[PDB]
RNA sequence: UAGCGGCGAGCGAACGGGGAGGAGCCCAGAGCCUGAAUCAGUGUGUGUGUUAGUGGAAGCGUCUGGAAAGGCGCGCGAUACAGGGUGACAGCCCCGUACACAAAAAUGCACAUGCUGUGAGCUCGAUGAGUAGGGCGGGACACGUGGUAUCCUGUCUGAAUAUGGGGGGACCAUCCUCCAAGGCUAAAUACUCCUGACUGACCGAUAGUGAACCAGUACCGUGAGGGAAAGGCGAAAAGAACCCCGGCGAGGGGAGUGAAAAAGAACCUGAAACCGUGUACGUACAAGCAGUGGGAGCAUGCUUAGGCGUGUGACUGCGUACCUUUUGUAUAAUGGGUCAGCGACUUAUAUUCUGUAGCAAGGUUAACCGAAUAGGGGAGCCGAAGGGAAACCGAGUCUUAACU
């Protein structure tokens, strides 16, 4: 029996255009151009959960470096002073009481400064 | 056995052909097979060689921008083609002797566990006429049945054409889909007898 | 219930069907690679082609001749021997029988296991230890 | 239809029980003076196809 | 399979067996005796059937809706619920349907059948010459001249004629077989331009016929010839009286029909590309497959008295499209303007292998007959033993003078 494929072909290029749906100009628009946009934007969205986890620890880091040479020490003695004291609170936090709560952030320094 | 629903007589009714396990896969393999036999089959297209179109290449193959082309009865274009245009053909199926008769001894089999199968004794409706037969088998507390009878009668033929929910048949004329697809049935002493001794 | 029947758990396959997708496995080429003669609609090559080396069977010798008494006599095993007529089986009687072919002949009773009761066979050739059995049973060839 | 056997194949091959074809030897027509006896005798006796080209004699001959 | 074959590609029988089907006679002529069997026509009978036909069963009260067959409750016919219509899905409103009856004429037939007309039983005797065969050259037979039988012949020739001749696959001799060179012949089988039913795991307007529509038309070609596109308002035209702007126009707006006029003749539904109009945010110091991860601001909704979602996306890290072909492509190699539709591993028959179901030293039927997808029909196939080129032997056998 004969089989009309004018349903199911619109069916799945509106899947694939509201996807798109926000891109410029044809990449929204028409689904040949869309269908490889969507594609890419996966591939990158990807690609970027990777780089996402990089981009942030180096954002931390720098925030660290930064709060810790007010106190008058560098990164790389910081971590290592912190490290020889056992102390186990990562990056992520230390850039946040870096910015947030700095009479605590005194105390790491002083807690390194031991080692 | 199978004691009656007006005697209480012992019928020996035999252990091998009534008294079997069920076997789903043949079965469903006879059933399909009935089914697919039913088809008539009768269809056609046409491909490109019995299209009503020229044999001329509408354009030459070179020099001009188009996509070469040689026939206005190719697939790919709008009116004339269908690649794989299908003839008519037989689609029905050799299923085996012993594997049919064995499907039918399984369904048959299976009624007795089920309680569709109802033995009766002399059955049959005194003239041809719907009313009667509408209202015998209130007393008799059936609905959707398949009435088997050896000693075939006119009369109960006649008058349950245009009745749906019954259908007659003789003895000799049982198949594996009419048996399956009814809720009930219905079967003569004479008309399990005769089945009896011709499925063995 | 007719709609609760289902078949064998292998019975159905499915099937390959070619050029679906990427998804598919198979597809975009029908698992018949990248060019060549196999690739092409109508392609693959005749039986028996080695590439334009001489094929097998033709660089082989030919031998022999097909006897024309070979296709009329047949190897009759003893296991079949007492199926027609208390125990006569001549020729006639054992293709009476369905066990031999028509035009057949010459035939020949082999060994191949048990015999019960006492088979008298006549006008037909006989193995040695056939023989042997035969007698063993009872029954006097000729 | 029904699949045509290579005849030339049905000649010069032969079934046995196993599965397997008898074959006669090659280089045994003519030229034979200058080849040895001890060749000579050994392409005297019928031999089995190989299984590296055995599949082209199955097909080529599918009825026995 | 046996054969044929640059023994390649390929082609490929017959005998014999199942069925379908059945049927046999005239002339190369004489006696007694003759219309008696036989057909080939004319009028003529019933069993009848075909081109007009007729009849042809049985439903309502409520609710919802523009409209009832619908939901809902009791019905009521069925040798009739095949099917089709009717303001939404009808067994019972109408057409029908089974089913019962139809023909003045034109008949299609088959048996009585008077009959221009035609010849039986049975004696004795005949039984198809430029022919069979041959030489040469071709062709047909599965058989390609080959060791090549057999039939047909263009050419050149030439028998014997039932104390006789042909065939039995080079050829020859006994046995078996038939009687050429003269004729007729129904059925099984092929086929559908065509006139009816009836069915589709056939299509549903780019499909299906080229052609659902005034299509083999328009149009193209000197001609042969090629050859399109183009379906649907509504239940019913009830197709919009009359006013208004306008060129006593096109088009529109009110009023009015209708259930509905973004159903108003382009008229069911009305997608996409494509072009618009408003609303929110962004956008005139910013470089690049235009996204992605982060992300303030801004515009906005919810419950709470604080959190969430949608839109936009300043700035910023990374980031050279897709397909094909390739050792390798952002490539400045190929292909694509876009969208919608159509567009590519199928079918039949054989064969081997895997799975799966049946039954098992057995398994299975084909055609076909059949109150028929039952059951008969095992003709046959395949298997149960091979070895040998083969005769032949056979749990062995081949090799060999013979095998430790
Ligand atoms: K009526
Ligand atoms: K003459
Ligand atoms: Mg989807
Ligand atoms: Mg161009
Ligand atoms: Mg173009
Ligand atoms: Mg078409
Ligand atoms: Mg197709
Ligand atoms: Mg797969
Ligand atoms: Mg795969
Ligand atoms: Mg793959
Ligand atoms: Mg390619
Ligand atoms: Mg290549
Ligand atoms: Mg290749
Ligand atoms: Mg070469
Ligand atoms: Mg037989
Ligand atoms: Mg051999
Ligand atoms: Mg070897
Ligand atoms: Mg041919
Ligand atoms: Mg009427
Ligand atoms: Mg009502
Ligand atoms: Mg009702
Ligand atoms: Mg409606
Ligand atoms: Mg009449
Ligand atoms: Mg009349
Ligand atoms: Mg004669
Ligand atoms: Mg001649
Ligand atoms: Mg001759
Ligand atoms: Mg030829
Ligand atoms: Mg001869
Ligand atoms: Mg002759
Ligand atoms: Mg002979
Ligand atoms: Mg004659
Ligand atoms: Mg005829
Ligand atoms: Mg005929
Ligand atoms: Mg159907
Ligand atoms: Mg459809
Ligand atoms: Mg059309
Ligand atoms: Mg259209
Ligand atoms: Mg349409
Ligand atoms: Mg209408
Ligand atoms: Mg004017
Ligand atoms: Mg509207
Ligand atoms: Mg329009
Ligand atoms: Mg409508
Ligand atoms: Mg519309
Ligand atoms: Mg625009
Ligand atoms: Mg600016
Ligand atoms: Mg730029
Ligand atoms: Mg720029
Ligand atoms: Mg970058
Ligand atoms: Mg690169
Ligand atoms: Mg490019
Ligand atoms: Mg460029
Ligand atoms: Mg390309
Ligand atoms: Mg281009
Ligand atoms: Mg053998």
């Given at each position: ?6 349903v199911?072909?619109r069916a799945?290029?509106?899947?694939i255009?509201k ?9 929204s628009?028409?689904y ?5 946009a969507?594609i ?5 969205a ?14 931390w ?11 008058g020490?560098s ?6 002073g912190l ?29 390194a400064?031991?080692? | 056995?199978l004691?009656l ?7 020996t009714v035999?252990?091998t052909t009534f008294?079997?396990?069920f ?7 006879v059933?399909?097979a009935?089914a ?9 297209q ?6 009503t179109?020229?044999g001329?290449?509408?354009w ?8 070469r082309?040689?026939?206005i009865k190719?697939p790919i ?16 199926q050799?299923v085996?002797?012993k594997?049919?008769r064995g ?6 089999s299976?009624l ?10 002399k059955?049959?409706?005194?003239a041809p006429?719907?009313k ?16 088997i ?9 006649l ?6 929910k ?6 000799t004329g ?14 003569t ?11 063995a | 219930?007719?709609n609760?029947?289902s078949?064998?758990?292998?019975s159905k ?10 998804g598919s496995?198979?597809g975009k080429?029908?698992?018949?690679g ?10 693959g090559?005749?039986?028996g082609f080695?590439?334009?080396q ?5 660089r ?5 001749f ?23 089986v001549?020729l006639n009687?054992?293709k009476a ?8 002949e010459?035939?020949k ?10 088979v008298?066979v006549?006008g037909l050739?006989?193995?040695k230890?056939?023989?042997?059995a035969?007698?063993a049973a009872?029954?006097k060839?000729? | 239809?029904?699949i045509?056997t290579?005849?030339?194949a049905?000649?010069r091959?032969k ?10 030897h ?6 034979l ?12 006796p019928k ?10 004699v199955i097909?080529?001959?599918p009825?026995?």
């Amino acid at each position: 029996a004969r089989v009309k494929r004018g349903v199911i072909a619109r069916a799945r290029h509106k899947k694939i255009l509201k996807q798109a749906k926000g891109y410029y100009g044809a990449r929204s628009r028409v689904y040949r151009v869309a269908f490889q946009a969507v594609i890419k934007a996966g591939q990158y969205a990807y690609r970027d959960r990777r780089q996402r986890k990089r981009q942030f620890r180096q954002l931390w880091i720098a925030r660290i470096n930064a709060a810790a040479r007010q106190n008058g020490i560098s990164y790389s003695k910081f971590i290592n002073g912190l490290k020889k004291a056992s102390v186990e609170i990562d990056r992520k936090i230390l850039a946040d009481i870096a910015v947030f709560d700095k009479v605590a952030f005194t105390a790491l320094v002083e807690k390194a400064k031991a080692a | 056995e199978l004691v009656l629903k007006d005697a209480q007589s012992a019928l020996t009714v035999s252990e091998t052909t009534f008294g079997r396990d069920f076997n789903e896969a043949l079965v469903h393999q006879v059933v399909v097979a009935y089914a697919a036999g039913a088809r008539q089959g009768t269809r056609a297209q046409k491909t490109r060689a019995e299209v009503t179109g020229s044999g001329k290449k509408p354009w030459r193959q070179k020099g001009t921008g188009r996509a070469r082309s040689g026939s206005i009865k190719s697939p790919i274009w709008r009116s004339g083609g269908v690649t794989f245009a299908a003839r008519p053909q037989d689609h029905s199926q050799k299923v085996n002797k012993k594997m049919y008769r064995g499907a039918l001894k399984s369904i048959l089999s299976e009624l007795v566990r089920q309680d569709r199968l109802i033995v009766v004794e002399k059955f049959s409706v005194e003239a041809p006429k719907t009313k009667l037969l509408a209202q015998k088998l209130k007393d008799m507390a059936l609905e959707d049945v398949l009435i088997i009878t050896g000693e075939l009668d006119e009369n109960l033929f006649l008058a349950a054409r245009n009745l749906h929910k019954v259908d007659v048949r003789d003895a000799t004329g049982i198949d594996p889909v009419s048996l399956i697809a009814f809720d009930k049935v219905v079967m003569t002493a004479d008309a399990v007898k005769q089945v009896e001794e011709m499925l063995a | 219930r007719l709609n609760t029947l289902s078949p064998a758990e292998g019975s159905k396959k499915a099937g390959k069907r070619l050029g679906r997708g990427i998804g598919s496995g198979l597809g975009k080429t029908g698992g018949r690679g990248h060019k060549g003669q196999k690739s092409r609609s109508g392609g693959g090559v005749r039986r028996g082609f080695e590439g334009g080396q001489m094929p097998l069977y033709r660089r082989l010798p030919k031998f022999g001749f097909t006897s024309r008494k070979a296709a009329i006599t047949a190897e009759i095993r003893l296991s079949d021997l007492a199926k027609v007529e208390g125990g006569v089986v001549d020729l006639n009687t054992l293709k009476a029988a369905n066990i031999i072919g028509i035009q057949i002949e010459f035939a020949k009773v082999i060994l191949a296991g048990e015999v019960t009761t006492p088979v008298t066979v006549r006008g037909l050739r006989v193995t040695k230890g056939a023989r042997a059995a035969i007698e063993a049973a009872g029954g006097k060839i000729e | 239809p029904k699949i045509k056997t290579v005849r030339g194949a049905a000649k010069r091959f032969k079934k046995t029980g196993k599965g397997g074809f008898k074959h006669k030897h090659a280089n045994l027509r003519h030229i034979l003076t200058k080849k040895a006896t001890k060749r000579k005798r050994h392409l005297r006796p019928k031999a089995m196809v190989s299984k590296g080209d055995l599949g082209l004699v199955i097909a080529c001959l599918p009825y026995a």
